[PDB]
Amino acid sequence: SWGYREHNGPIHWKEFFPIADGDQQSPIEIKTKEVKYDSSLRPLSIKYDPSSAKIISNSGHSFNVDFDDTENKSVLRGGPLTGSYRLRQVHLHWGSADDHGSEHIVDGVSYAAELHVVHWNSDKYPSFVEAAHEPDGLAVLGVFLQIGEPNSQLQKITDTLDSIKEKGKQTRFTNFDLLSLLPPSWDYWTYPGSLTVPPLLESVTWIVLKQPINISSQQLAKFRSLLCTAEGEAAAFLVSNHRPPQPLKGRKVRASFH
Ligand SMILES: CC(=O)Nc1nnc(S(N)(=O)=O)s1
Ligand SMILES: [Zn+2]
Protein backbone atom coordinates (compact mmCIF):
# COMPACT_ATOMS: atom_id res chain seq x y z
CA SER A 1 0.00 0.00 0.00
CA TRP A 2 1.15 3.52 -0.86
CA GLY A 3 2.64 6.02 1.57
CA TYR A 4 5.44 8.55 1.92
CA ARG A 5 8.13 6.19 3.18
CA GLU A 6 11.11 5.13 1.04
CA HIS A 7 9.56 1.88 -0.22
CA ASN A 8 5.98 3.08 -0.85
CA GLY A 9 6.60 6.75 -1.55
CA PRO A 10 5.79 9.06 -4.52
CA ILE A 11 8.43 7.62 -6.87
CA HIS A 12 6.76 4.22 -6.40
CA TRP A 13 3.20 5.44 -6.99
CA LYS A 14 3.33 4.79 -10.75
CA GLU A 15 3.68 1.13 -9.76
CA PHE A 16 0.17 1.13 -8.29
CA PHE A 17 -1.43 3.95 -10.27
CA PRO A 18 -0.22 4.35 -13.90
CA ILE A 19 -1.89 7.77 -13.98
CA ALA A 20 0.97 8.95 -11.73
CA ASP A 21 2.69 9.78 -15.03
CA GLY A 22 -0.35 11.49 -16.56
CA ASP A 23 -0.28 14.76 -18.49
CA GLN A 24 -2.08 16.79 -15.80
CA GLN A 25 -0.52 15.72 -12.52
CA SER A 26 -0.10 17.82 -9.37
CA PRO A 27 1.60 19.45 -7.63
CA ILE A 28 3.90 21.58 -9.81
CA GLU A 29 6.44 24.37 -9.54
CA ILE A 30 4.95 27.79 -10.20
CA LYS A 31 7.45 29.86 -12.20
CA THR A 32 6.20 33.43 -11.92
CA LYS A 33 8.18 34.42 -15.02
CA GLU A 34 6.04 32.03 -17.06
CA VAL A 35 2.73 32.99 -15.47
CA LYS A 36 0.23 34.85 -17.63
CA TYR A 37 -2.36 37.20 -16.17
CA ASP A 38 -5.88 36.49 -17.43
CA SER A 39 -8.47 39.27 -17.28
CA SER A 40 -11.14 36.64 -17.91
CA LEU A 41 -10.56 35.33 -14.39
CA ARG A 42 -13.21 36.37 -11.87
CA PRO A 43 -12.63 37.21 -8.22
CA LEU A 44 -12.99 34.26 -5.87
CA SER A 45 -16.28 34.15 -4.01
CA ILE A 46 -15.91 32.22 -0.77
CA LYS A 47 -18.84 31.49 1.53
CA TYR A 48 -17.94 29.22 4.47
CA ASP A 49 -20.35 28.34 7.28
CA PRO A 50 -18.52 27.54 10.55
CA SER A 51 -21.29 25.08 11.42
CA SER A 52 -20.36 23.02 8.34
CA ALA A 53 -17.37 21.32 10.00
CA LYS A 54 -18.26 17.99 11.60
CA ILE A 55 -15.21 15.91 12.50
CA ILE A 56 -11.42 15.70 12.33
CA SER A 57 -9.51 12.47 11.82
CA ASN A 58 -6.18 10.85 11.01
CA SER A 59 -6.42 9.16 7.61
CA GLY A 60 -2.86 7.90 7.92
CA HIS A 61 -1.70 10.41 5.30
CA SER A 62 -2.74 13.66 7.02
CA PHE A 63 -5.48 15.02 9.28
CA ASN A 64 -8.85 15.51 7.55
CA VAL A 65 -11.48 17.98 8.71
CA ASP A 66 -14.67 16.71 7.10
CA PHE A 67 -17.59 19.05 6.44
CA ASP A 68 -21.23 18.28 5.80
CA ASP A 69 -21.68 18.66 2.06
CA THR A 70 -25.33 17.62 1.86
CA GLU A 71 -26.19 21.29 2.20
CA ASN A 72 -25.01 24.26 0.14
CA LYS A 73 -23.92 26.37 3.14
CA SER A 74 -20.19 26.34 2.37
CA VAL A 75 -19.38 26.92 -1.27
CA LEU A 76 -16.64 28.29 -3.51
CA ARG A 77 -17.49 30.22 -6.68
CA GLY A 78 -15.89 32.57 -9.18
CA GLY A 79 -12.21 32.53 -10.00
CA PRO A 80 -11.71 30.19 -12.99
CA LEU A 81 -14.79 28.19 -11.98
CA THR A 82 -18.14 27.72 -13.69
CA GLY A 83 -20.87 27.01 -11.14
CA SER A 84 -20.84 26.38 -7.40
CA TYR A 85 -18.41 24.02 -5.65
CA ARG A 86 -19.37 22.66 -2.23
CA LEU A 87 -16.84 22.51 0.62
CA ARG A 88 -15.83 18.97 1.41
CA GLN A 89 -12.65 18.73 3.47
CA VAL A 90 -9.54 20.48 4.71
CA HIS A 91 -6.13 18.85 5.20
CA LEU A 92 -2.44 19.74 5.39
CA HIS A 93 0.86 18.73 3.79
CA TRP A 94 4.31 19.21 5.31
CA GLY A 95 7.88 17.94 5.15
CA SER A 96 10.38 16.38 7.55
CA ALA A 97 11.87 19.86 8.12
CA ASP A 98 10.67 23.48 7.96
CA ASP A 99 12.67 24.31 4.81
CA HIS A 100 10.78 21.91 2.51
CA GLY A 101 7.17 20.90 3.13
CA SER A 102 4.77 22.50 0.63
CA GLU A 103 3.49 20.49 -2.32
CA HIS A 104 3.53 23.31 -4.86
CA ILE A 105 6.76 25.28 -4.95
CA VAL A 106 7.29 28.84 -6.19
CA ASP A 107 10.34 29.90 -8.20
CA GLY A 108 12.37 27.03 -6.74
CA VAL A 109 11.22 27.73 -3.17
CA SER A 110 9.34 25.36 -0.86
CA TYR A 111 7.25 26.75 1.97
CA ALA A 112 7.01 24.88 5.28
CA ALA A 113 3.54 23.45 4.69
CA GLU A 114 0.45 23.73 2.49
CA LEU A 115 -3.24 23.76 3.39
CA HIS A 116 -5.77 22.27 0.95
CA VAL A 117 -9.48 23.09 0.92
CA VAL A 118 -11.24 20.49 -1.24
CA HIS A 119 -14.48 21.32 -3.08
CA TRP A 120 -16.61 19.50 -5.65
CA ASN A 121 -18.98 20.61 -8.40
CA SER A 122 -22.38 20.05 -6.74
CA ASP A 123 -24.11 21.93 -9.54
CA LYS A 124 -23.32 19.29 -12.17
CA TYR A 125 -22.67 16.08 -10.24
CA PRO A 126 -24.62 14.03 -7.64
CA SER A 127 -21.68 13.42 -5.32
CA PHE A 128 -18.03 14.14 -4.66
CA VAL A 129 -17.26 10.56 -5.68
CA GLU A 130 -18.57 11.12 -9.18
CA ALA A 131 -17.25 14.67 -9.43
CA ALA A 132 -13.77 13.34 -8.60
CA HIS A 133 -13.95 11.49 -11.93
CA GLU A 134 -14.73 14.53 -14.11
CA PRO A 135 -12.30 17.17 -15.50
CA ASP A 136 -14.43 19.96 -14.04
CA GLY A 137 -15.49 18.00 -10.97
CA LEU A 138 -13.15 19.27 -8.26
CA ALA A 139 -11.60 22.52 -7.08
CA VAL A 140 -8.84 22.64 -4.48
CA LEU A 141 -7.76 25.87 -2.84
CA GLY A 142 -4.15 25.82 -1.72
CA VAL A 143 -2.73 28.02 1.02
CA PHE A 144 0.99 28.12 1.74
CA LEU A 145 2.23 28.18 5.33
CA GLN A 146 5.55 29.80 6.12
CA ILE A 147 7.39 29.84 9.42
CA GLY A 148 6.64 32.91 11.50
CA GLU A 149 4.80 33.90 14.65
CA PRO A 150 2.39 31.42 16.21
CA ASN A 151 -1.00 31.44 14.46
CA SER A 152 -3.81 31.36 17.00
CA GLN A 153 -6.21 30.25 14.24
CA LEU A 154 -4.47 26.86 14.15
CA GLN A 155 -4.89 26.20 17.87
CA LYS A 156 -8.30 24.60 17.40
CA ILE A 157 -6.70 22.06 15.06
CA THR A 158 -3.48 21.48 17.02
CA ASP A 159 -5.43 20.91 20.26
CA THR A 160 -6.98 17.77 18.72
CA LEU A 161 -3.77 16.19 17.42
CA ASP A 162 -3.17 14.01 20.48
CA SER A 163 -6.70 12.58 20.28
CA ILE A 164 -6.17 11.49 16.66
CA LYS A 165 -2.50 10.52 16.87
CA GLU A 166 -3.19 7.09 15.38
CA LYS A 167 -4.41 6.37 11.85
CA GLY A 168 -8.16 5.84 11.91
CA LYS A 169 -8.76 7.97 15.01
CA GLN A 170 -11.37 10.72 14.86
CA THR A 171 -13.06 13.22 17.17
CA ARG A 172 -15.88 15.74 16.76
CA PHE A 173 -14.76 19.03 15.21
CA THR A 174 -17.32 21.78 14.75
CA ASN A 175 -17.76 25.56 14.82
CA PHE A 176 -14.60 26.12 12.79
CA ASP A 177 -13.85 29.55 11.32
CA LEU A 178 -12.09 28.38 8.15
CA LEU A 179 -12.36 31.77 6.45
CA SER A 180 -10.19 33.44 9.11
CA LEU A 181 -7.45 30.96 8.26
CA LEU A 182 -7.06 32.37 4.73
CA PRO A 183 -4.60 35.22 3.97
CA PRO A 184 -5.92 38.79 3.66
CA SER A 185 -5.28 38.75 -0.10
CA TRP A 186 -6.89 36.15 -2.34
CA ASP A 187 -4.72 36.78 -5.39
CA TYR A 188 -4.05 33.36 -6.91
CA TRP A 189 -2.57 31.18 -9.62
CA THR A 190 -4.65 28.51 -11.34
CA TYR A 191 -4.01 25.52 -13.57
CA PRO A 192 -5.65 22.17 -14.42
CA GLY A 193 -4.27 19.30 -12.35
CA SER A 194 -5.04 16.30 -10.19
CA LEU A 195 -5.29 14.93 -6.68
CA THR A 196 -1.82 14.83 -5.10
CA VAL A 197 -2.51 11.44 -3.49
CA PRO A 198 -3.77 8.16 -4.99
CA PRO A 199 -5.92 7.62 -6.99
CA LEU A 200 -4.30 10.81 -8.41
CA LEU A 201 -7.37 11.55 -10.56
CA GLU A 202 -6.97 14.44 -13.02
CA SER A 203 -10.18 16.22 -12.07
CA VAL A 204 -8.84 19.20 -10.16
CA THR A 205 -8.93 22.87 -11.03
CA TRP A 206 -6.17 24.14 -8.74
CA ILE A 207 -6.35 27.57 -7.13
CA VAL A 208 -3.16 28.38 -5.25
CA LEU A 209 -3.09 31.61 -3.25
CA LYS A 210 0.03 33.73 -3.65
CA GLN A 211 0.07 35.10 -0.10
CA PRO A 212 1.06 32.59 2.61
CA ILE A 213 -0.13 32.46 6.21
CA ASN A 214 2.03 32.03 9.29
CA ILE A 215 2.72 29.06 11.55
CA SER A 216 5.41 28.76 14.23
CA SER A 217 8.04 26.02 14.08
CA GLN A 218 6.63 24.64 17.35
CA GLN A 219 3.11 24.44 15.91
CA LEU A 220 4.16 22.70 12.70
CA ALA A 221 6.25 20.16 14.62
CA LYS A 222 3.06 18.89 16.27
CA PHE A 223 1.77 17.54 12.95
CA ARG A 224 4.91 15.42 12.57
CA SER A 225 4.03 13.70 15.84
CA LEU A 226 1.03 12.10 14.11
CA LEU A 227 1.42 8.48 13.01
CA CYS A 228 0.68 6.98 9.61
CA THR A 229 -0.06 3.73 11.48
CA ALA A 230 -2.97 2.44 13.56
CA GLU A 231 -3.23 1.80 17.29
CA GLY A 232 -1.84 -1.61 18.28
CA GLU A 233 0.21 -1.68 15.07
CA ALA A 234 3.95 -1.14 14.44
CA ALA A 235 4.62 2.60 14.72
CA ALA A 236 5.82 5.01 12.04
CA PHE A 237 5.53 8.79 12.22
CA LEU A 238 3.99 10.90 9.47
CA VAL A 239 7.07 13.15 9.32
CA SER A 240 6.46 14.12 5.69
CA ASN A 241 3.48 13.90 3.36
CA HIS A 242 4.05 16.12 0.32
CA ARG A 243 4.39 14.91 -3.26
CA PRO A 244 7.31 16.22 -5.39
CA PRO A 245 6.45 18.74 -8.11
CA GLN A 246 5.28 17.08 -11.34
CA PRO A 247 6.11 17.93 -15.00
CA LEU A 248 4.02 20.85 -16.27
CA LYS A 249 3.59 19.14 -19.66
CA GLY A 250 2.62 22.32 -21.50
CA ARG A 251 -0.15 23.35 -19.12
CA LYS A 252 -0.84 27.05 -18.68
CA VAL A 253 -0.56 28.59 -15.21
CA ARG A 254 -2.75 31.68 -14.98
CA ALA A 255 -2.64 34.60 -12.54
CA SER A 256 -5.73 36.43 -11.31
CA PHE A 257 -3.60 39.46 -10.50
CA HIS A 258 -1.29 41.87 -12.32
C1 LIG B 1 -11.25 12.36 -0.35
C2 LIG B 1 -10.41 13.43 -0.96
O1 LIG B 1 -10.67 14.63 -0.88
N1 LIG B 1 -9.29 12.98 -1.65
C3 LIG B 1 -8.21 13.75 -2.03
N2 LIG B 1 -7.20 13.22 -2.67
N3 LIG B 1 -6.22 14.15 -2.96
C4 LIG B 1 -6.54 15.32 -2.51
S1 LIG B 1 -5.49 16.74 -2.72
N4 LIG B 1 -4.21 16.54 -1.83
O2 LIG B 1 -5.11 16.69 -4.09
O3 LIG B 1 -6.23 17.85 -2.22
S2 LIG B 1 -8.06 15.44 -1.71
ZN1 LIG C 1 -3.74 17.85 -0.39
Coordinates of C-alpha atoms in Angstrom, one line a residue, residues 64-254:
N64 CA -8.8 15.5 7.5
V65 CA -11.5 18.0 8.7
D66 CA -14.7 16.7 7.1
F67 CA -17.6 19.1 6.4
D68 CA -21.2 18.3 5.8
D69 CA -21.7 18.7 2.1
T70 CA -25.3 17.6 1.9
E71 CA -26.2 21.3 2.2
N72 CA -25.0 24.3 0.1
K73 CA -23.9 26.4 3.1
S74 CA -20.2 26.3 2.4
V75 CA -19.4 26.9 -1.3
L76 CA -16.6 28.3 -3.5
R77 CA -17.5 30.2 -6.7
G78 CA -15.9 32.6 -9.2
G79 CA -12.2 32.5 -10.0
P80 CA -11.7 30.2 -13.0
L81 CA -14.8 28.2 -12.0
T82 CA -18.1 27.7 -13.7
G83 CA -20.9 27.0 -11.1
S84 CA -20.8 26.4 -7.4
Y85 CA -18.4 24.0 -5.6
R86 CA -19.4 22.7 -2.2
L87 CA -16.8 22.5 0.6
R88 CA -15.8 19.0 1.4
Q89 CA -12.7 18.7 3.5
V90 CA -9.5 20.5 4.7
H91 CA -6.1 18.8 5.2
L92 CA -2.4 19.7 5.4
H93 CA 0.9 18.7 3.8
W94 CA 4.3 19.2 5.3
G95 CA 7.9 17.9 5.1
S96 CA 10.4 16.4 7.5
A97 CA 11.9 19.9 8.1
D98 CA 10.7 23.5 8.0
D99 CA 12.7 24.3 4.8
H100 CA 10.8 21.9 2.5
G101 CA 7.2 20.9 3.1
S102 CA 4.8 22.5 0.6
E103 CA 3.5 20.5 -2.3
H104 CA 3.5 23.3 -4.9
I105 CA 6.8 25.3 -4.9
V106 CA 7.3 28.8 -6.2
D107 CA 10.3 29.9 -8.2
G108 CA 12.4 27.0 -6.7
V109 CA 11.2 27.7 -3.2
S110 CA 9.3 25.4 -0.9
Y111 CA 7.2 26.8 2.0
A112 CA 7.0 24.9 5.3
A113 CA 3.5 23.4 4.7
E114 CA 0.4 23.7 2.5
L115 CA -3.2 23.8 3.4
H116 CA -5.8 22.3 1.0
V117 CA -9.5 23.1 0.9
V118 CA -11.2 20.5 -1.2
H119 CA -14.5 21.3 -3.1
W120 CA -16.6 19.5 -5.6
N121 CA -19.0 20.6 -8.4
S122 CA -22.4 20.1 -6.7
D123 CA -24.1 21.9 -9.5
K124 CA -23.3 19.3 -12.2
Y125 CA -22.7 16.1 -10.2
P126 CA -24.6 14.0 -7.6
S127 CA -21.7 13.4 -5.3
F128 CA -18.0 14.1 -4.7
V129 CA -17.3 10.6 -5.7
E130 CA -18.6 11.1 -9.2
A131 CA -17.2 14.7 -9.4
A132 CA -13.8 13.3 -8.6
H133 CA -13.9 11.5 -11.9
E134 CA -14.7 14.5 -14.1
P135 CA -12.3 17.2 -15.5
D136 CA -14.4 20.0 -14.0
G137 CA -15.5 18.0 -11.0
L138 CA -13.2 19.3 -8.3
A139 CA -11.6 22.5 -7.1
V140 CA -8.8 22.6 -4.5
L141 CA -7.8 25.9 -2.8
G142 CA -4.1 25.8 -1.7
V143 CA -2.7 28.0 1.0
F144 CA 1.0 28.1 1.7
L145 CA 2.2 28.2 5.3
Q146 CA 5.6 29.8 6.1
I147 CA 7.4 29.8 9.4
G148 CA 6.6 32.9 11.5
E149 CA 4.8 33.9 14.7
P150 CA 2.4 31.4 16.2
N151 CA -1.0 31.4 14.5
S152 CA -3.8 31.4 17.0
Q153 CA -6.2 30.2 14.2
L154 CA -4.5 26.9 14.1
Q155 CA -4.9 26.2 17.9
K156 CA -8.3 24.6 17.4
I157 CA -6.7 22.1 15.1
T158 CA -3.5 21.5 17.0
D159 CA -5.4 20.9 20.3
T160 CA -7.0 17.8 18.7
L161 CA -3.8 16.2 17.4
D162 CA -3.2 14.0 20.5
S163 CA -6.7 12.6 20.3
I164 CA -6.2 11.5 16.7
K165 CA -2.5 10.5 16.9
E166 CA -3.2 7.1 15.4
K167 CA -4.4 6.4 11.9
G168 CA -8.2 5.8 11.9
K169 CA -8.8 8.0 15.0
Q170 CA -11.4 10.7 14.9
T171 CA -13.1 13.2 17.2
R172 CA -15.9 15.7 16.8
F173 CA -14.8 19.0 15.2
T174 CA -17.3 21.8 14.7
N175 CA -17.8 25.6 14.8
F176 CA -14.6 26.1 12.8
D177 CA -13.9 29.5 11.3
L178 CA -12.1 28.4 8.2
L179 CA -12.4 31.8 6.5
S180 CA -10.2 33.4 9.1
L181 CA -7.4 31.0 8.3
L182 CA -7.1 32.4 4.7
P183 CA -4.6 35.2 4.0
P184 CA -5.9 38.8 3.7
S185 CA -5.3 38.7 -0.1
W186 CA -6.9 36.1 -2.3
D187 CA -4.7 36.8 -5.4
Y188 CA -4.0 33.4 -6.9
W189 CA -2.6 31.2 -9.6
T190 CA -4.7 28.5 -11.3
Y191 CA -4.0 25.5 -13.6
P192 CA -5.7 22.2 -14.4
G193 CA -4.3 19.3 -12.3
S194 CA -5.0 16.3 -10.2
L195 CA -5.3 14.9 -6.7
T196 CA -1.8 14.8 -5.1
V197 CA -2.5 11.4 -3.5
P198 CA -3.8 8.2 -5.0
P199 CA -5.9 7.6 -7.0
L200 CA -4.3 10.8 -8.4
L201 CA -7.4 11.6 -10.6
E202 CA -7.0 14.4 -13.0
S203 CA -10.2 16.2 -12.1
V204 CA -8.8 19.2 -10.2
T205 CA -8.9 22.9 -11.0
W206 CA -6.2 24.1 -8.7
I207 CA -6.3 27.6 -7.1
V208 CA -3.2 28.4 -5.3
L209 CA -3.1 31.6 -3.3
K210 CA 0.0 33.7 -3.6
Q211 CA 0.1 35.1 -0.1
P212 CA 1.1 32.6 2.6
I213 CA -0.1 32.5 6.2
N214 CA 2.0 32.0 9.3
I215 CA 2.7 29.1 11.6
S216 CA 5.4 28.8 14.2
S217 CA 8.0 26.0 14.1
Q218 CA 6.6 24.6 17.3
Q219 CA 3.1 24.4 15.9
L220 CA 4.2 22.7 12.7
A221 CA 6.3 20.2 14.6
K222 CA 3.1 18.9 16.3
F223 CA 1.8 17.5 12.9
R224 CA 4.9 15.4 12.6
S225 CA 4.0 13.7 15.8
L226 CA 1.0 12.1 14.1
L227 CA 1.4 8.5 13.0
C228 CA 0.7 7.0 9.6
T229 CA -0.1 3.7 11.5
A230 CA -3.0 2.4 13.6
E231 CA -3.2 1.8 17.3
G232 CA -1.8 -1.6 18.3
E233 CA 0.2 -1.7 15.1
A234 CA 3.9 -1.1 14.4
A235 CA 4.6 2.6 14.7
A236 CA 5.8 5.0 12.0
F237 CA 5.5 8.8 12.2
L238 CA 4.0 10.9 9.5
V239 CA 7.1 13.2 9.3
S240 CA 6.5 14.1 5.7
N241 CA 3.5 13.9 3.4
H242 CA 4.0 16.1 0.3
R243 CA 4.4 14.9 -3.3
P244 CA 7.3 16.2 -5.4
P245 CA 6.4 18.7 -8.1
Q246 CA 5.3 17.1 -11.3
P247 CA 6.1 17.9 -15.0
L248 CA 4.0 20.8 -16.3
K249 CA 3.6 19.1 -19.7
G250 CA 2.6 22.3 -21.5
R251 CA -0.2 23.4 -19.1
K252 CA -0.8 27.1 -18.7
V253 CA -0.6 28.6 -15.2
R254 CA -2.8 31.7 -15.0

